[PDB]
Design a protein around this nucleic acid. Structure first.
Lengths: 170, 205, 56, 159, 293
RNA sequence: UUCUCAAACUUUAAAUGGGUAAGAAGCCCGGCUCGCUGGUGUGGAGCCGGGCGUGGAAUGCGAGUGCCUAGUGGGCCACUUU
RNA sequence: GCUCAGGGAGGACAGAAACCUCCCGUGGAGCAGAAGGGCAAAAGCUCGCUUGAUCUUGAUUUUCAGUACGAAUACAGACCGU
RNA sequence: GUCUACGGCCAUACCACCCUGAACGCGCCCGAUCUCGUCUGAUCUCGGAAGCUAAGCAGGGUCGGGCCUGGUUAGUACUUGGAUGGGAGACCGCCUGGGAAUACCGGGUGCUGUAGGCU
């Protein structure tokens, strides 16, 4: 038997739509994540001014959304479906997470709206394990130890075991 | 053009480098501090002759440069381009100041950086030549050619080391034989009985 | 008409003629600069040494 | 003339020792300072309030006043050609108990013991510190072997 | 390949934080202001009342910090509440109060301030003040050491505070952090705070899960069904805790047994053993290589 | 790994140097006072009354203290560091 | 209540650089400015509440003649903030 | 023998990796009705006790890195005081006392206070 406390699970599904825009194109991309997840997504202000991009210091560039537990498993089921249950070798982080993208949100389960428009958006599966909430406390914190960590090799075989995801190189 | 080396001979000041504070220093004449076949193995140039300073004085970047070539020019005709490796073991880091009177006087008489000079101690090596054990007199000749370019007194001393290393030549052959030394370019790697035992394993494989 | 700006040359000799004197090391020191909330209380303790004189 | 100013030439004096920066260890604050406690002064840089002036850093005085977070301490800064026993209000962290008086006090209660004892037993003791005397005569035994011959070693230049 | 931050050069310059700071147990910022006495008090012990709520326990200590390490005068544990009727539910706001009330009367037992400074015998929930009595030994004053607990309204650290406050400990506090503080218009309904101390916040959840599904109530409250605590028992159960705590507050220690004195713990592999392993490993390698080739 | 360095760099780190201590203003019990501080004849300080002189390192030397006060306030040289 | 500079691996547009993750991170950032010292559950960053930048005696430090101003340190008496 | 709470000194205590942990704690863990706080009950707060030492944590390991401590360097460098010493000088030697720092080479790898357990 393997230990049932090494149960590799999803912590959060980090979504964001970085439009490089404020006002009207951004505040209607906020409605996209709230139709998608069913929770009020946080707007992201700029780091500093890059004049080439069309951003500026403390300008709302993006709108991000963290989904936990029962909902995130079901939205990551919606989103992998858009990527016909397949991801690449490069797509998985060395820290043991993986993510992907989708070019338009119509393929998720939202119908085309003429007024609101189209928005491609980011999926990043933050894979965790019971005892990963040590490292972000106020009380006695600590690093999670080397054996307990999720590797790149481990996240790929998990996704292949869970979603039957055919992983292909390049 | 520039002043005689009498004026800036004795280590008079505190050591005054090209720094954040001293800006406006020209490039020194010496920029190669080793030529010959510098891209050489440890086990082909055993003999090492040093030009050791007998006097506490300042050797100019120009005197180091003039001696850099004087030893090089002889040893190329005497041993061939790849039959030696000269180092210049002095870098002109002390900046020398000039006060130019073109109606000032000694008012605000702080010098502008003129050039650079190498601050040398008694028993400090100026130039070292590693060549084959055959060419013992060619080093003693080439270093004596280059003594005249410097002020003060230099001593040509044949070191009891293995090329440009700090271990002795009568000990070297055994310290490589017992894998206490691996060659690594011009110099050698000292391997103590102290690291992790995986460091020991790739040695004795 | 420039002058000598500063020295401390003859000064050590001058200091040691009548001697570098330690201060008047006099027992029972002053109580100027001692915190007044403590010094008020001590002053009341001194006021009422009459009170317990016959016990004493 | 020098740039006059309170913290001038205190780059090292009021700097922290290597790998002894950060939090002030709390034994500093929880030791009691009585009146007439012989106390040596050492301006810790971490706490910038109630700092001693650089002329008192490495001096030793006695505490005359004790307030909440600081002691008033009488120290001998000289001046040019005399000595002024003077009073500085210094915080706890710039201050230790000096162990200079301790070798006296542990000698006094040892002197008091060596006087109260042999008050009846009649044996006269040495209580005054005799200096390091001229070492009295003794026999150096050579255990058979001759004293090993040393000779000066001949010259070689190293480098 | 990038420059490794953790070289030889790293750990030479590296200054470790204090041991309790490395273990994430003490805020040395917050400790320094709690613990230091005014220098014109001289050895007058500054008492701090240390409440630490754990996963399975509530540790309520009174300490005064000497220079060798702080000396604990009185320790009150939630695992001592089953001597007073509270079998399970050791870690809730009601148990916090009982542990604080147990600390208060146990200290006052030892100092002979048992009969004096009763306080709130009937739990009201109000802002009570332990006033000093003229002619009697002055009320014991200590200060609430919260640790690294985010002090929100209804933090159980304030349960054990109010527990101690009602037992006759003169601790400074405000009712802003007690549960029942109406934040929206800045009032404090003492009735809601009475619910939490007598445990009607837990009682209503037992009643909420009683009706919806029986399967989930057995999962949540598995030991309240075992140890036979119904929600109607709850309020009169903590009064049997409060009554017996105030009656018999003294702690009786567990007597030490004649133990085997065996070793559970692998001892430090000494030099001649460690100097031998490197001799054995090197021998083990070079013999395997000659046998191979 | 290696060559070479720092008045305005430094982990280290002297020599010479700068405070302090080497007792009766010091010891050690006992008791009184407080409006300060307090779980608490608690803490601290102030006070009376005591009781102990092998004067508690070497060396040399009598010290302490207060008035009035002139001249001076261009300096210069030398060893050493600069 | 937080963690910074920077690096690393990921991810629609998206690139050397936009936002989002996770990890490393002794301060290599920031703290109005000169530079030094000081600082990591902070003295930095982000929010909340505010007027201790108020009123009032002395003592002390710093330059010092051991005078002023300036600045500063320890209190004490209030009235307040958190 | 060991842990917990709170500490004192703050690396002989850190760091990377590996192995072992009995009982008790400590934990991860399970919840979101209340208190409470968020984009999200992840954090924080609250309410619990099915499972598990996987991790934190503890002990131990590594010819580990670092740190600690010695020997070496070396009476070397430098230095107090001295000379009608030397040398054109630069600098050096002696007398008289003091006396370092790497590289290199061994050893060590937290002590412990108060309170409370477990064996």
């Amino acid at each position: 038997k393997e230990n049932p406390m090494r149960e590799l699970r999803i912590r959060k599904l980090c979504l964001n739509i970085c439009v490089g825009e404020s006002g009207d194109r951004l505040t209607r991309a906020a409605k996209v994540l709230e139709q998608l997840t069913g929770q009020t997504p946080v707007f992201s202000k700029a780091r500093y001014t890059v004049r080439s991009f069309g951003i500026r210091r403390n300008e709302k560039i993006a709108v991000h959304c963290t989904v936990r537990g029962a909902k995130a498993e079901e939205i990551l089921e919606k989103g992998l479906k858009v990527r016909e249950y397949e991801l690449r070798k490069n797509n998985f982080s060395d820290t043991g997470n993986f993510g992907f993208g989708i070019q338009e949100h119509i393929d998720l389960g939202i119908k085309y709206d003429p007024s609101i428009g189209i928005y491609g958006l980011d999926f990043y599966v933050v894979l965790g394990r019971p005892g990963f909430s040590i490292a972000d406390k106020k009380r006695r914190t600590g690093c999670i130890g080397a054996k307990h960590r999720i590797s790149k090799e481990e996240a790929m075989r998990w996704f292949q075991q869970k979603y039957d995801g055919i992983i292909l190189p390049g | 053009g520039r002043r005689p080396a009498r004026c800036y001979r004795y280590c008079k000041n505190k050591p005054y480098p090209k720094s954040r504070f001293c800006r406006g220093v020209p490039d020194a004449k010496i920029r190669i501090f080793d030529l010959g076949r510098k891209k050489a193995k440890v086990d082909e140039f055993p003999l090492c002759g040093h030009m050791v300073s007998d006097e506490y004085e300042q050797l100019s970047s120009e005197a180091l440069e003039a001696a850099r070539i004087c030893a090089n020019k002889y040893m190329v005709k005497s041993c061939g381009k790849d039959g030696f490796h000269i180092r210049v073991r002095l870098h002109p880091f002390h900046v020398i100041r000039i006060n130019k009177m073109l109606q000032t006087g000694m008012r605000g008489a702080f010098g502008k950086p003129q050039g650079t000079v190498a601050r040398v101690h008694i028993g400090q090596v100026i130039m070292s030549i590693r060549t084959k054990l055959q060419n013992k007199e060619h080093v003693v000749e080439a270093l004596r050619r280059a003594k005249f370019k410097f002020p003060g007194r230099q001593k040509i001393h044949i070191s009891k080391k293995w090329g440009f290393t700090k271990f002795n030549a009568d000990e070297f052959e055994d310290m490589v034989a017992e894998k206490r030394l691996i060659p690594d370019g011009c110099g050698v790697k000292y391997i103590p009985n102290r690291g992790p035992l995986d460091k020991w394993r790739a040695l004795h494989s | 008409a420039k002058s000598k700006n500063h020295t401390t040359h003859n000064q050590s000799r001058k200091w040691h003629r009548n001697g570098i004197k330690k201060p008047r090391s006099q027992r029972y020191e002053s109580l100027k600069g001692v915190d007044p909330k403590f010094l008020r209380n001590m002053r009341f303790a001194k006021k009422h040494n009459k009170k317990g004189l016959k016990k004493m | 003339t020098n740039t006059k100013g309170k913290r001038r030439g205190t780059r090292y004096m009021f700097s922290r020792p290597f790998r002894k920066h950060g939090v002030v260890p709390l034994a500093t604050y929880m030791r009691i300072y009585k009146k007439g406690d012989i106390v040596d002064i050492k301006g810790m840089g971490t706490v910038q309030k109630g700092m001693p002036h650089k002329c008192y850093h490495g001096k030793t005085g006695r505490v005359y006043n004790v307030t909440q977070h600081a002691v008033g301490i009488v120290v001998n800064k000289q001046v040019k050609g005399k000595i002024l026993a003077k009073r500085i209000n210094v915080r706890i962290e710039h201050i230790k108990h000096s162990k200079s008086r301790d070798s006296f006090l542990k000698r006094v209660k040892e002197n008091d013991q060596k006087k109260k004892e042999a008050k009846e037993k009649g044996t006269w003791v040495q209580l005054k510190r005799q200096p390091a005397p001229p070492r009295e005569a003794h026999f150096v035994r050579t255990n058979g072997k001759e004293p090993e011959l040393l000779e000066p070693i001949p010259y070689e230049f190293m480098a | 390949f990038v420059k490794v931050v953790k070289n030889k050069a790293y750990f030479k310059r590296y200054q470790v934080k204090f041991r309790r700071r490395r273990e994430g147990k003490t805020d040395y910022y917050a400790r320094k202001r709690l613990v230091i006495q005014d220098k014109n008090k001289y050895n007058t012990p500054k008492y701090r009342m240390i409440v630490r709520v754990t996963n399975r326990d509530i540790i309520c200590q009174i300490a005064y910090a000497r220079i060798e390490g702080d000396m604990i005068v009185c320790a009150a544990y939630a695992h001592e509440l089953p001597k007073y009727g509270v079998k399970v539910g050791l870690t809730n706001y009601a148990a916090a109060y009982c542990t604080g009330l147990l600390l208060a009367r146990r200290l006052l037992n030892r100092f002979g301030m048992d009969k004096i400074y009763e306080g709130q015998v009937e739990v009201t929930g109000d802002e009570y003040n332990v006033e000093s009595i003229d002619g009697q030994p002055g009320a014991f004053t200590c200060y609430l050491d919260a640790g690294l607990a985010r002090t929100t309204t209804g933090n159980k650290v304030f349960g054990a505070l109010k527990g101690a406050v009602d037992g006759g400990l003169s601790i400074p506090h405000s009712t802003k952090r007690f549960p029942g503080y109406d934040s929206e218009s800045k009032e404090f309904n003492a009735e809601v705070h009475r619910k939490h101390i007598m445990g009607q916040n837990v009682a209503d959840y037992m009643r909420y899960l009683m009706e919806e599904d029986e399967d989930a109530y057995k999962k949540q409250f598995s030991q309240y069904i075992k140890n036979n605590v119904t929600p109607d028992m709850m309020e009169e159960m903590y009064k049997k805790a409060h009554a017996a705590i105030r009656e018999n507050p003294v702690y009786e220690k567990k007597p030490k047994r004649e133990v085997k004195k065996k070793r559970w713990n692998r001892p430090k592999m000494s030099l001649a053993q460690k100097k031998d392993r490197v001799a054995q490993k090197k021998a083990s390698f070079l013999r395997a290589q000659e046998r191979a080739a």
